Amino acid sequence: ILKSFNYPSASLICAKAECLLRLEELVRGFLISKETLSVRMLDDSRDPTP
Amino acid sequence: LGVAAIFGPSHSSSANAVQSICNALGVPHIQTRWKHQVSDNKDSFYVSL
């Protein structure tokens, strides 16, 4: 879908660490960076505003 | 046989099974190698080294 968006600078937000396994093919298929894909994960209190 | 703590194993899936057999029964599971910990595991009865 991203390649049909011409690979814009994404930002995966994963609720739990298991996302990195659930989406391993996407994370390792990209170049993790500030301008390509940055994986930010929700914390303990589950407040996503920061 | 009656034990006091159950060390090992080393693989992640086998380690997780023994860790919940213990967390249930209440004897300490004292691991040695890193395992894939599930994020919602409410097991109080295990100790990693």
Q: Does A16 touch chain B (CB under 8 A)?
A: yes
Rounded-to-integer distance, Cα A37 and Cα A25, Å:
13
Say if CB B26 and CB B45 are below 8 A apart: yes
Chain centroid to Cα A17, Å, comes to 11
Rounded-to-integer distance, Cα B48 and Cα B31, Å:
5
- Resolution number, Å: 5.3
Instruction: List the alpha helices (DSSP H) in B1-48.
Output: 12-25
Q: Which residues of A touch B39 (CB under 8 A)?
A: 16-18
In three-state secondary structure terms, B46 is: strand
Paired tokens of A32: 């993790």
Q: Does A17 touch chain B (CB under 8 A)?
A: yes
Q: What is the DSSP letter of A5?
A: G
Say if CB B47 and CB B24 are below 8 A apart: no
Q: What separation in angstroms does the CA of A25 have from each of A20, A49, B37?
A: 9, 27, 21
Say if CB A23 and CB A17 are below 8 A apart: no
Paired tokens of B27: 């004897």
Structural method: cryo-EM
